[PDB]
């Protein structure tokens, strides 16, 4: 009835909505109304898949978050420590997914609104990667406090540096799509050093049977595949116009984020059972 609109082709878009020239049709027009943007969630356009991937994913980690947070304290060795450390992971996860599906909804509002939620969606990715190291580094170096605090300092200065760069207007431009890929991929590349440290500090066999050696492989693959699909727009690059709505590169990257954070939680969980289990106690 009120607030009607129709999708427009790529050529009649403003400059701040031309982020992917391989998506030819199905774009929402510039609508400076939040009521129209939130109602577009239930309509078909180029952002429908991007919205629902992290809208549903935010519920997945809102459920996983308050389930782990409300686990009875008589099951943790240090309830205050282990929950605050786990809280940083779900906090960065809820912030990342919320700042993302909100960005992809109000993406067609105006230039100021898109510019604002773009920096939040970028900073949310860094918050997730930073928050992912907090539980992983806690149990990996449960008996070695020196590398546990040193690696926390490095991840902090690397993630804050990424957030600082994310606040630059030329960072979000289409010409720096490979740059945005390399930044948050290099942020995950930092975790290779503590992964090898934990492998040589413990037994090389323990790095496989205890916890998951495939954790690093599953994570590194989803990091590489996520960055590659994002920086190259693989599904649409081959056949532009055939992936305007579904199975575009940004959608597969959205799912890989939820899947990788899901694997990391499942990895830290079994990494936790080893720390307060025998043969996993502190040694010299």
């Amino acid at each position, epitope marked *: *009835s*009120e607030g009607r609109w129709r999708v427009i082709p790529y050529d009649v878009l403003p400059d701040w909505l031309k982020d992917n020239d391989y998506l030819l049709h199905g774009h*929402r027009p*510039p*609508m*400076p109304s939040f009521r129209a943007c939130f109602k577009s969630i239930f309509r078909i356009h180029t952002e429908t898949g991007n919205i629902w991937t992290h809208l549903l994913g935010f519920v997945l980690f809102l459920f996983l978050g308050i389930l782990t947070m409300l686990r009875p304290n008589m099951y943790f060795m240090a309830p205050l420590q282990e929950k605050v450390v786990f809280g940083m992971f779900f906090l960065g996860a809820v912030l990342c997914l919320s700042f993302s599906w909100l960005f992809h909804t109000v993406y067609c509002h105006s230039e100021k609104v898109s510019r604002t939620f773009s920096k939040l969606a970028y900073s949310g990715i860094a918050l997730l990667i930073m928050g992912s190291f907090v539980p992983w580094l806690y149990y990996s170096f449960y008996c070695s406090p020196q590398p546990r605090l040193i690696y926390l300092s490095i991840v902090c200065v690397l993630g804050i540096s990424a957030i600082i760069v994310a606040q630059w207007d030329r960072f979000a431009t289409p010409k720096h799509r490979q740059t945005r890929a390399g930044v948050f991929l290099g942020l995950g590349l930092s975790g290779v050093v503590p992964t090898m440290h934990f492998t040589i500090a413990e037994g090389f066999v323990k790095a496989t049977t205890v916890g998951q050696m495939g954790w690093f492989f599953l994570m590194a693959v989803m990091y590489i595949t996520g960055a590659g699909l994002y920086a190259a727009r693989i599904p649409e690059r081959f056949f532009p116009g055939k992936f305007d709505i579904w199975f575009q590169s940004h959608q597969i990257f959205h799912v890989l984020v939820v899947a990788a954070a899901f694997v990391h939680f499942y990895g830290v969980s079994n990494l936790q059972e080893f720390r307060y289990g025998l043969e996993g106690g502190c040694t010299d």
Partner: antibody
Amino acid sequence: EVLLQQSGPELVKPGASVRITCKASGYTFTDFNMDWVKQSPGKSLEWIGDFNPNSGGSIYNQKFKDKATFTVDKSSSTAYMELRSLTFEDTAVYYCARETGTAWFAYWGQGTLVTVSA
Amino acid sequence: DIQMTQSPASLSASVGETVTITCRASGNIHNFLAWYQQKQGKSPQVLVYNAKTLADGVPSRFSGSGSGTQYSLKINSLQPEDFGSYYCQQFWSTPYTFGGGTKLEIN
């Protein structure tokens, strides 16, 4: 470039009908909606309705529900408006305007003056 | 039916001065407003759409502002060729409606 060419001026006696043409070119005709505006001489613009050529739907202004009728010819990228039972109050210039997602008109036709006299 | 109301109606100014045309809507239209300039005997041309977005090719002197129910169209330096008729329209409500119009004279 995008151009909207309309039919020539109309001079008809009262009680007759007329059909106004809007020939579109320079874009995919089915991608946008086409509206119709009425401007009486010395008066302001009146929105008659819009038309979706892709789906065939049309939403009329209740002031013109028994006055105008929208038609299309996708094979020629052309739109039509049909005014019936013309009186002196219908003597005006009728425009066809194209939308761009939302109903803000960046392209207008040159106008078709329909004059009703006796 | 959301009805628009233009305040100036008949505007007169000199060359170089700043003028403003306001357009008050009866109901909220959520910045779905467009401004048009019409010359004598010719079709109108859009100046500002979506309340503030300047249309392509329009001089920088034309500015759009407002929110909710009150909106404005400001002209920085009035030019001798800016005379004509100016209209505001809303494309939020089901029956789209234009304003009363504002004739602009240059002395």
